[PDB]
Amino acid sequence: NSVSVDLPGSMKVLVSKSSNADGKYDLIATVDALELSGTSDKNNGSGVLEGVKADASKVKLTISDDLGQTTLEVFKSDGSTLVSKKVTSKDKSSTEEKFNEKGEVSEKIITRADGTRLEYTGIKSDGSGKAKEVLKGYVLEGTLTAEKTTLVVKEGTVTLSKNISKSGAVSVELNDTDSSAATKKTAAWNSGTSTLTITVNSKKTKDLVFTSSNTITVQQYDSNGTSLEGSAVEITKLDEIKNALK
Known part of the structure; x- marks a missing residue:
């Protein structure tokens, strides 16, 4: 019936x-x-x-x-x-x-189809809050604002930031307080390939690819700083991101 x-x-x-x-x-x-x-x-x-x-x-x-x-x-x-x-x-x-109590959003958990998550807690009336991205094997922590989510990994003098814009686009930036031009890291973000290229002393050292499967890969360049060598390795733990930033 x-x-x-x-x-x-x-x-x-x-x-x-x-x-x-x-x-x-x-x-x-x-x-x-x-x-x-x-x-x-x-x-x-x-x-x-x-x-x-x-x-x-x-x-x-x-x-x-x-x-x-x-x-x-x-x-x-x-x-x-x-x-x-x-x-x-x-x-x-x-x-x-x-x-x-006043029926305003105070928490939002987004679960992707692959099970990775964006967790926003302590959300305020201006849309600011604490942010956490839960990936396979590791978590990235940061802050939320109405302009962007910023997830941060620090290693030595290096700060890596994964920014997720309000509309969802991704950009990655690298800051380094090291002042010695021989060892200080700088990096370029290629929005087209979702790839962060790190450079030390005018030579490329590593590509960090932020894949559409919500993983990170790292691949080293040759000593020549021009050609990729070997093959990219998938990050499975936060220590590997920190190692990439040394």
């Missing part, structure tokens, strides 16, 4: 096989221990469902028309102000937000 549909974000909805006299389908969904119910124009699992937690919190689940997006929202008991919101997008990334 009804069709079961699996939903992005580990949920499931039951849909009536045929519509009522208003043309609408009934929906019942299970979300952890909670039962939600609602209606829809389609028979495919899309629609809007509501329920109440044992503590009187209102819950709403919205499923996009194409079943590609789900939004799970938790509100205060009068349903007026958000407490939490989780969205799973069609690219299988996820965004989880918490809201403070």
